[PDB]
Coordinates of N, CA, C and O in Angstrom, one line a residue:
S3 N 99.9 112.7 92.9 CA 101.2 113.3 92.7 C 102.4 112.4 93.3 O 103.4 112.2 92.6
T4 N 102.3 112.0 94.5 CA 103.1 110.9 95.0 C 102.9 109.7 94.1 O 103.8 109.0 93.8
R5 N 101.6 109.5 93.7 CA 101.2 108.3 92.9 C 102.0 108.4 91.6 O 102.5 107.4 91.1
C6 N 102.0 109.6 91.0 CA 102.7 109.8 89.7 C 104.2 109.7 89.9 O 104.9 109.0 89.0
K7 N 104.8 110.2 90.9 CA 106.3 110.0 91.2 C 106.6 108.6 91.3 O 107.5 108.1 90.7
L8 N 105.8 107.8 92.1 CA 106.1 106.4 92.2 C 105.9 105.6 90.9 O 106.7 104.8 90.6
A9 N 104.9 106.0 90.1 CA 104.6 105.3 88.9 C 105.9 105.4 88.0 O 106.3 104.5 87.3
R10 N 106.5 106.6 88.0 CA 107.6 106.9 87.2 C 108.8 106.0 87.5 O 109.4 105.4 86.6
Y11 N 109.1 105.8 88.8 CA 110.1 104.8 89.2 C 109.8 103.4 88.8 O 110.6 102.7 88.2
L12 N 108.5 103.0 89.0 CA 108.1 101.7 88.6 C 108.3 101.4 87.1 O 108.6 100.3 86.7
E13 N 108.0 102.5 86.3 CA 108.2 102.3 84.8 C 109.6 102.1 84.4 O 110.0 101.7 83.3
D14 N 110.5 102.4 85.4 CA 112.0 102.2 85.1 C 112.4 100.8 85.5 O 113.6 100.5 85.2
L15 N 111.6 100.0 86.1 CA 111.9 98.6 86.4 C 112.0 97.8 85.1 O 111.1 97.9 84.3
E16 N 113.1 97.1 84.9 CA 113.2 96.0 83.9 C 112.2 94.9 84.2 O 111.8 94.8 85.4
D17 N 111.9 93.9 83.3 CA 110.9 92.9 83.6 C 111.3 92.0 84.8 O 110.4 91.8 85.7
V18 N 112.5 91.6 84.9 CA 113.0 90.8 86.0 C 112.9 91.6 87.4 O 112.5 91.0 88.4
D19 N 113.2 92.9 87.3 CA 113.1 93.8 88.5 C 111.6 93.9 88.9 O 111.3 93.8 90.1
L20 N 110.7 94.1 88.0 CA 109.2 94.3 88.3 C 108.7 93.0 88.9 O 107.9 93.1 89.9
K21 N 109.0 91.8 88.4 CA 108.6 90.5 89.0 C 109.0 90.5 90.4 O 108.2 90.2 91.4
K22 N 110.3 90.8 90.7 CA 110.8 90.8 92.0 C 110.2 91.8 92.9 O 109.8 91.6 94.1
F23 N 109.9 93.0 92.4 CA 109.3 94.1 93.2 C 107.9 93.7 93.6 O 107.5 93.9 94.7
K24 N 107.1 93.2 92.6 CA 105.8 92.6 93.0 C 105.9 91.5 94.0 O 105.1 91.5 94.8
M25 N 106.8 90.6 93.9 CA 106.9 89.5 95.0 C 107.0 90.2 96.3 O 106.5 89.7 97.2
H26 N 107.9 91.2 96.3 CA 108.1 91.8 97.6 C 106.9 92.4 98.2 O 106.7 92.4 99.3
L27 N 106.1 93.0 97.3 CA 104.9 93.6 97.7 C 103.9 92.6 98.3 O 103.3 92.8 99.3
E28 N 103.8 91.5 97.6 CA 102.9 90.4 97.9 C 103.3 89.7 99.2 O 102.5 89.2 99.9
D29 N 104.6 89.7 99.4 CA 105.2 89.0 100.5 C 105.9 89.9 101.6 O 106.8 89.5 102.2
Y30 N 105.4 91.1 101.7 CA 106.1 92.1 102.5 C 106.2 91.7 104.0 O 105.3 91.3 104.5
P31 N 107.4 92.0 104.5 CA 107.7 91.4 105.8 C 106.8 92.1 106.8 O 106.6 93.3 106.8
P32 N 106.3 91.2 107.8 CA 105.1 91.5 108.4 C 105.1 92.4 109.7 O 104.1 92.5 110.4
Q33 N 106.3 92.9 110.0 CA 106.4 93.8 111.2 C 106.9 95.2 110.9 O 107.9 95.6 111.4
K34 N 106.2 95.8 109.9 CA 106.5 97.2 109.7 C 105.3 98.2 110.0 O 105.5 99.4 110.1
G35 N 104.1 97.7 110.2 CA 103.0 98.5 110.2 C 102.5 98.6 108.7 O 101.6 99.4 108.4
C36 N 103.1 97.8 107.9 CA 102.7 97.7 106.4 C 101.9 96.5 106.1 O 102.1 95.4 106.7
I37 N 101.0 96.6 105.1 CA 100.1 95.4 104.8 C 100.6 94.9 103.4 O 100.7 95.7 102.5
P38 N 100.8 93.6 103.3 CA 101.1 93.1 102.0 C 100.0 93.3 101.0 O 98.8 93.3 101.4
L39 N 100.3 93.3 99.7 CA 99.3 93.5 98.6 C 98.8 92.1 98.1 O 99.6 91.1 98.0
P40 N 97.6 92.0 97.7 CA 97.1 90.7 97.1 C 97.7 90.3 95.8 O 98.0 91.2 95.0
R41 N 98.0 89.0 95.6 CA 98.7 88.6 94.4 C 97.9 88.9 93.1 O 98.6 89.3 92.1
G42 N 96.6 88.7 93.1 CA 95.9 89.0 91.8 C 95.9 90.4 91.3 O 96.4 90.7 90.2
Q43 N 95.6 91.3 92.2 CA 95.5 92.7 91.8 C 96.9 93.2 91.5 O 97.1 94.0 90.6
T44 N 97.9 92.7 92.3 CA 99.3 93.2 92.1 C 99.9 92.7 90.7 O 100.4 93.5 89.9
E45 N 99.8 91.4 90.5 CA 100.2 90.8 89.2 C 99.5 91.5 88.0 O 100.2 91.8 87.0
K46 N 98.2 91.8 88.1 CA 97.5 92.4 87.0 C 97.8 93.8 86.7 O 97.5 94.3 85.7
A47 N 98.3 94.5 87.7 CA 98.4 96.0 87.6 C 99.5 96.5 86.8 O 100.6 96.1 86.9
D48 N 99.2 97.4 85.9 CA 100.2 98.1 85.2 C 100.9 99.1 86.1 O 100.6 99.2 87.2
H49 N 101.8 99.9 85.6 CA 102.7 100.7 86.4 C 102.0 101.7 87.2 O 102.2 101.9 88.4
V50 N 101.1 102.5 86.6 CA 100.4 103.5 87.3 C 99.3 102.9 88.3 O 99.2 103.3 89.4
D51 N 98.7 101.9 87.8 CA 97.8 101.1 88.7 C 98.5 100.5 89.9 O 97.8 100.4 90.9
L52 N 99.7 100.1 89.8 CA 100.4 99.5 90.9 C 100.7 100.5 91.9 O 100.6 100.3 93.1
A53 N 101.1 101.8 91.5 CA 101.3 102.8 92.4 C 100.0 103.1 93.2 O 100.1 103.3 94.4
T54 N 98.9 103.3 92.4 CA 97.6 103.5 93.0 C 97.2 102.4 94.1 O 96.7 102.7 95.1
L55 N 97.5 101.1 93.7 CA 97.2 100.0 94.6 C 98.1 100.0 95.9 O 97.5 99.8 97.0
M56 N 99.3 100.4 95.7 CA 100.2 100.5 96.9 C 99.7 101.6 97.9 O 99.7 101.4 99.1
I57 N 99.2 102.8 97.4 CA 98.7 103.9 98.2 C 97.3 103.5 98.8 O 97.0 103.7 100.0
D58 N 96.5 102.7 98.0 CA 95.2 102.4 98.5 C 95.3 101.4 99.7 O 94.5 101.5 100.6
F59 N 96.3 100.5 99.6 CA 96.5 99.5 100.6 C 97.2 100.1 101.9 O 96.9 99.6 103.0
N60 N 98.2 101.0 101.7 CA 99.0 101.4 102.8 C 99.1 102.9 103.1 O 99.7 103.3 104.1
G61 N 98.5 103.7 102.2 CA 98.6 105.2 102.3 C 99.9 105.7 101.7 O 100.8 104.9 101.5
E62 N 100.0 107.0 101.5 CA 101.1 107.6 100.7 C 102.5 107.3 101.3 O 103.4 106.8 100.7
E63 N 102.6 107.7 102.6 CA 103.9 107.7 103.3 C 104.5 106.3 103.4 O 105.7 106.0 103.0
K64 N 103.6 105.3 103.9 CA 104.1 103.9 103.9 C 104.4 103.3 102.5 O 105.3 102.5 102.4
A65 N 103.6 103.7 101.5 CA 103.8 103.1 100.1 C 105.2 103.6 99.6 O 105.9 102.8 99.0
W66 N 105.5 104.8 99.9 CA 106.8 105.3 99.5 C 107.9 104.6 100.2 O 108.9 104.2 99.6
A67 N 107.8 104.4 101.6 CA 108.8 103.7 102.4 C 109.0 102.2 101.8 O 110.1 101.6 101.8
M68 N 107.8 101.6 101.5 CA 107.9 100.2 101.0 C 108.7 100.2 99.6 O 109.5 99.3 99.4
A69 N 108.4 101.2 98.8 CA 109.0 101.3 97.5 C 110.5 101.4 97.7 O 111.3 100.7 97.0
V70 N 110.9 102.3 98.6 CA 112.4 102.5 98.9 C 113.0 101.2 99.3 O 114.1 100.9 98.8
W71 N 112.3 100.6 100.3 CA 113.0 99.4 100.8 C 113.1 98.3 99.7 O 114.1 97.6 99.7
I72 N 112.1 98.2 98.9 CA 112.1 97.1 97.9 C 113.2 97.4 96.9 O 113.9 96.5 96.4
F73 N 113.3 98.7 96.5 CA 114.4 99.1 95.5 C 115.7 98.7 96.0 O 116.5 98.1 95.2
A74 N 116.0 98.9 97.3 CA 117.3 98.5 97.8 C 117.4 96.9 97.7 O 118.5 96.3 97.4
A75 N 116.3 96.2 98.0 CA 116.3 94.8 98.2 C 116.5 94.1 96.9 O 117.1 93.0 96.8
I76 N 116.0 94.7 95.8 CA 116.2 94.1 94.5 C 117.4 94.7 93.7 O 117.5 94.5 92.5
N77 N 118.2 95.5 94.4 CA 119.4 96.0 94.0 C 119.3 97.0 92.8 O 120.1 97.1 91.9
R78 N 118.3 97.8 92.9 CA 118.1 98.9 92.1 C 118.5 100.2 92.9 O 117.7 100.9 93.4
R79 N 119.8 100.3 93.2 CA 120.2 101.3 94.1 C 120.0 102.7 93.4 O 119.9 103.7 94.1
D80 N 120.0 102.8 92.1 CA 119.6 104.0 91.5 C 118.2 104.6 91.9 O 118.1 105.8 92.3
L81 N 117.3 103.7 91.9 CA 115.9 104.1 92.1 C 115.8 104.2 93.7 O 115.1 105.1 94.1
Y82 N 116.5 103.5 94.4 CA 116.5 103.6 95.9 C 117.0 105.1 96.2 O 116.4 105.8 97.0
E83 N 118.1 105.5 95.6 CA 118.6 106.8 95.9 C 117.8 108.0 95.3 O 117.6 109.0 95.9
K84 N 117.2 107.7 94.2 CA 116.3 108.7 93.6 C 115.0 108.9 94.4 O 114.6 110.0 94.7
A85 N 114.4 107.7 94.9 CA 113.2 107.9 95.7 C 113.6 108.6 97.1 O 112.8 109.3 97.6
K86 N 114.7 108.3 97.6 CA 115.2 108.8 98.9 C 115.4 110.3 98.8 O 115.1 111.1 99.7
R87 N 115.9 110.8 97.6 CA 116.2 112.2 97.4 C 115.0 112.9 96.8 O 114.9 114.1 96.8
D88 N 114.0 112.1 96.4 CA 112.7 112.7 95.9 C 111.6 112.3 96.7 O 110.4 112.2 96.3
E89 N 111.8 112.2 98.0 CA 110.7 111.9 99.0 C 109.9 113.1 99.3 O 110.4 114.2 99.7
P90 N 108.5 113.0 99.1 CA 107.6 114.1 99.4 C 107.8 114.5 100.8 O 108.3 113.8 101.7
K91 N 107.4 115.8 101.1 CA 107.3 116.3 102.4 C 105.9 115.9 102.9 O 104.9 116.5 102.5
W92 N 105.9 114.9 103.8 CA 104.7 114.3 104.2 C 103.7 115.3 104.9 O 104.2 116.2 105.5

């Protein structure tokens, strides 16, 4: 269900946005308690599978935080504010 909420935001990424979102995942800055994702599985993953991959690598709460940060970073402030206002009660 977190997985499905995240998949829905990811389906809203334009092609350029998705490429950049995936780079950020693969290259995630290394002092958060977050683990970057492998390039093969990340590049290959469709939208729902990418949400699943994010949760499998980092768990629900961190995957959500990563998604919020990256949305801001790639200037999708709409998805940044939507995920922030649609954050699960952990």
